[PDB]
Amino acid sequence: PTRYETLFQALDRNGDGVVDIGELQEGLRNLGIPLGQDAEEKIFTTGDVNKDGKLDFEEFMKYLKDHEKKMKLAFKSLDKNNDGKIEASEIVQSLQTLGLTISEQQAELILQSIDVDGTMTVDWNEWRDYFLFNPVTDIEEIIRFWKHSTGIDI
Ligand SMILES: [Ca+2]
Ligand SMILES: [Ca+2]
Ligand SMILES: [Ca+2]
């Protein structure tokens, strides 16, 4: 969704051309996107470049685009076989290259936590859709998020 107009119009409830923090909270909660207020605030603070307390469409778009390049490099960092998809063994080996060692079952837990549809594996579109509003900037903070999200070791 790389123009992001639909998302923005979805969030701009009063249709004034900007998204306020309230609209972000109410909108994300109404769209069934589970996000904490401090993290939403992280998004807003990173995005609000002119610091007027509002997110115009170009700040919104810029944030989402840069965030999606960070997420694409993270995804390709996790993608070993270059298929365009992520399997559990790949989570295991990618984590093993980082010095972390995790079981296959915990890897399964991670994939299931990340996966929002029934695919049982995660392609670029699902990865991007999942981390769309998650203010993580790279793979290490993605790991920190996993560590809180699954409530598992490392
Ligand atoms: Ca608005
Ligand atoms: Ca602004
Ligand atoms: Ca794979």
Residue numbers in the entry: 21 to 174
Copy text verbatim from the article accompanying this structure deposition.
The mitochondrial ATP-Mg/Pi carrier (APC) is a member of the mitochondrial carrier family of transport proteins. Therefore, APC has the important role of altering the mitochondrial adenine nucleotide pool in order to adapt to changing cellular energetic demands. The N-terminal domain of APC forms a calcium-sensitive regulatory domain.
The consequence of calcium binding to the regulatory domain of APC is a stimulation of the substrate transport activity of the carrier. A structure of the regulatory domain of human APC isoform-1 has recently been solved, confirming the presence of four EF-hands, each of which is occupied by a bound calcium ion in a canonical pentagonal bi-pyramidal fashion. The EF-hands group together into two pairs, forming two lobes connected by a long central α-helix, in a similar fashion to the four EF-hands of calmodulin. The linker region between the N-terminal regulatory domain and the C-terminal carrier domain contains an amphipathic α-helix of unknown function. In the structure this α-helix is bound to EF-hand pair 3 and 4, analogous to the binding of a calmodulin recognition sequence motif to the hydrophobic pockets in the EF-hands of calmodulin. The protein construct used in the previous study of the HsAPC-1 regulatory domain was mutated at the extreme N-terminus to replace a cysteine residue at position 15 with a serine, raising the possibility that a native dimer could have been disrupted. Therefore, the mechanism that couples calcium binding in the regulatory domain to substrate transport in the carrier domain has not been resolved. Here, an independent structural determination of the native human APC-1 regulatory domain was completed, which was combined with an investigation into the oligomeric state of the full-length human APC-1 protein. Furthermore, an extensive comparison of the conformations of EF-hand proteins in the calcium-free, calcium-bound and peptide-bound state was undertaken, which has allowed us to propose a mechanism for the regulation of APC that is consistent with all available experimental data.
